[PDB]
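hiii so my PI (J.) wants the whole complex modelled not just the main chain, which honestly fair. so below is everything: nine entries, each one labled with what it is. i double checked the lines twice but i was tired so who knows lol
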Amino acid sequence: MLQPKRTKFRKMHKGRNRGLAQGTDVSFGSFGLKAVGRGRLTARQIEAARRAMTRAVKRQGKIWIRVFPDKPITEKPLAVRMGKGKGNVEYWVALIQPGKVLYEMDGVPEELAREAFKLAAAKLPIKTTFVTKTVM
Amino acid sequence: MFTINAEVRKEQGKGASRRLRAANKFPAIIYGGKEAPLAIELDHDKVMNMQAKAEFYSEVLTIVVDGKEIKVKAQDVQRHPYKPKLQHIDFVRA
Amino acid sequence: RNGRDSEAKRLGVKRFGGESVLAGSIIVRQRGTKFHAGANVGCGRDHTLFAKADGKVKFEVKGPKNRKFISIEAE
Amino acid sequence: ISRHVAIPDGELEITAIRAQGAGGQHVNKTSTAIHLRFDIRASSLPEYYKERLLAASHHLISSDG
Amino acid sequence: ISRHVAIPDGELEITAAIHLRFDIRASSLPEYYKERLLAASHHLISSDGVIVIKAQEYRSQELNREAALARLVAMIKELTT
RNA sequence: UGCCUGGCGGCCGUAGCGCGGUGGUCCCACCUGACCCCAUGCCGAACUCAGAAGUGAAACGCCGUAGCGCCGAUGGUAGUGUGGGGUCUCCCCAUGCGAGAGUAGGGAACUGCCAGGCAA
RNA sequence: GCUCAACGGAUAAAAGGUACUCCGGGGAUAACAGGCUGAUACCGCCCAAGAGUUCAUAUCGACGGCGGUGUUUGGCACCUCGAUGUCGGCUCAUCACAUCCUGGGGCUGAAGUAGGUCCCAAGGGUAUGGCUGUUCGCCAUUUAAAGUGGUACGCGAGCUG
RNA sequence: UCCUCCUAAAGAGUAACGGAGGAGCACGAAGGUUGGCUAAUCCUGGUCGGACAUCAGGAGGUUAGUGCAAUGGCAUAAGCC
RNA sequence: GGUUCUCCCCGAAAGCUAUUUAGGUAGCGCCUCGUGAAUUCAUCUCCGGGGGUAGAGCACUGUUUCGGCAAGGGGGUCAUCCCGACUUACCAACCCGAUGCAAACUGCGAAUACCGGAGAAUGUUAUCACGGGAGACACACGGCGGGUGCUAACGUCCGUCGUGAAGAGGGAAACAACCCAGACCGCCAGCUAAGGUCCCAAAGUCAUGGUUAAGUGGGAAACGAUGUGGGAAGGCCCAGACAGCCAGGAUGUUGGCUUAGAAGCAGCCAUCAUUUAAAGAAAGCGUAAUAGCUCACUGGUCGAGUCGGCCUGCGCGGAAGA
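here's the output for the full assembly
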């Protein structure tokens, strides 16, 4: 659970999920897990993706996370009617636009990095792809 | 040595660029000196496998336009959001 | 558990630039000082901008900080 | 020293039936808002503390545990 | 439904042929049972919480190492109830 | 008139900050004195008067410099009015409009009134 | 000169009960039941660290994810307030297959017997009592087995109450 | 009941038992005018003084301040004397 | 609850304010009739405007990632009482660079919209003031922008538009709001609209080029798969490739280490050079440990293309209810 400590507000709007991504380039690392679909990555999944990737590479390499939740999403207590005020925050989600890179790797061969991202994709709700770091 | 063919466009817009990118050919631009920033339209497929080579972004390219040869230099490449496709290339007329 | 609200005060520019306003017409009803008084334009105590002469309104950008001024030329 | 609530998600069977006593037609009809669980002895979390629940005479716990 | 794990070997001040060890107070087991741990008057436990363990019957060094540690966790489970 | 300096505006970071060099007949600054006008909630620093031997460090003007700030195309992209469409928690097609960011590049100002100085 | 703060301020001055109720109305608004949704619940699936002597996928499968059904509790008030009588039991059923037994198969951490698990299959079959108003549930004793549900959680112009 | 913000779809306005917070005052001065001045916080040195006391220089620059909530606004100061 | 002849003209609203008000009512908004008035009002063009929303950005308000640097508290050799020397492997901010996010962030910023002026055509004056009389103030769905809700609901609350409401007729099988389309009356007339043209059922078993094997069409996901079409790039290739078949797959070895029995095959772990067309001190099975079959890999015969992935057109499973 990657929560931003000491924030400004406590509960915000759900809003929309429009347009393409911004952080689309493959930075720092040699590899990257790019987003294809349009979804909502929760903090628990993100934790699960990092867990299910360090097992493949086994402690070697550098793991960059090109994303962060920072969106307090609330839920209502079950068995209570509508209204009465907006619910209590339960979990944090990261809004995902198509084309956003999620994880980047370096210090790993093209073989082992590739299957590492194969396990990470199985823990996430959004459909993804795999891209290399291109020069210029 | 890295020569490729090109063609000038007739329409410059969102209606134009989207319409031509669907028929496998993408827009580009070249600029240098005090001439006109030429609106370049070239083939899509060939350039994709051409930019896969890293030497593409170092050597002075030799594109052609209506018989004339102009030696340019690739400066900026505007890739696609999530697809292995190309959108816009900014050459500098060297 | 809060649910409260204040009645809007209908601020903003009432009469725009290019209008031949009358003597005593409110040009802009603002809260801060988004627009300053200029030629033939009076600034109220609530920084409400009113007119003195007649004629069309012009929105001039001047000063070091590029703050916007408003004047009225008699045409 | 360190102790944390486990409550095996799924290992604890949970049923739901109607309530008893009085209370109009909401307690005899859709009163299935009442529970009745099932925690077999086959669960065995601590294994050795488990055998102490079984031989332990008590209510709310049958002979088969 | 309340998985138990009394993990020994941590913040210790085990001094010692027959052991005379102490237990650090500024850590280990929080305020709810720490106050229950700091409110025991049996004169084995001092007025600080640096508890003077005087285990002397379990002769051997390594034996009294764990026996005094046994004196620790037994005193702990009583005061963590 | 070529340049000079000072006052007052326009235009108001292309106009400004940083660095290096540089000007003194005149102007400006600095500087001298301060029992008088006036002055410090202490003090001739500030403020005011009366003068001005010396100087150009400082300040100011000017010059080089882009070392920073700033300005900023072309095309593409985002978006979007209206009309159609889809797989319609979001996009596509027609059509009109069309960014921001970034790139080439530009860039260390321009101009007016007045006053005497300058070789006139 | 009024926190006339229920703040356009009913009088200067005002709290409760009614299952003894009553009248006028409403499906503008609840309780049963139906409808939409499917959070929850149930089922199925994807991933695979680990467990399983060795061995991820014989049997499980944490961390997370993706659907299905419309049996639970809910959400929502769209039908009914010039009435849709509501638990259980009794009688009589009836359909679904996500199968409890019988049948037909694959795998096995299947020697044999007996088993575990998945697949095909709904023809037929699928207890009796003790306790409780019970559904459920516990227990005693059986049976090849004592299925899960849908049917206004079937059935009161059929009975019981 | 009233005030500011957001929701409010770049005029105004715009709901919800939507999301954040405040008011039921103060002052003869904190009002008017004239004149002057204009910060916060940091680096350094120094009688006790160290975390910041008072003083001095430097950087910095309104991140300050404004009798109060918040937004808007302010040095041509509405900020300070 | 009910409220009785006829025809012609126009034609609403379900909003805001306030209300012991919330299924009432009042004024205003929208209807009507009459009156009197100004090219008065509306669409288009041009022109003059301010906005800060979408988008975008990251100086500001906060938040977030990584790297370079970096004091101070502590840890320690120590002061071995402070002072203090040093390191800092630690908590390691502050500043510099590189990367994201925002309804309550803005050094940026549209399109629309809104206000005003001039200009032309058009519209039975469609604009406004005044008086008579109202109704209505329970709205519904669809589209677009949201709040809320589980980015559930024919859900709920707003903005705006449309329709129904108060509007039939054709179409979506049936189907108030969906798409087309505004019924003065009559006609056994003709042309189109959405949507359609084998039969039911009026109209092409129409014309040409391709696609699918599932009745996909004609309910759907993650995910899986030599389904199959198109397109591009790459690898090896008649000094003959791919795959079968003819054979080998070896030298030290128990591989040294725990040499406790674990002989390439329980396990650390490291791993050379030989005979040479080649052979990993090893891929799997089987093994206390063997062997064997061997697989990588390497030469011959046959003798021609073939291998692995990338982007997509359409399909298959995934896919079970009374």
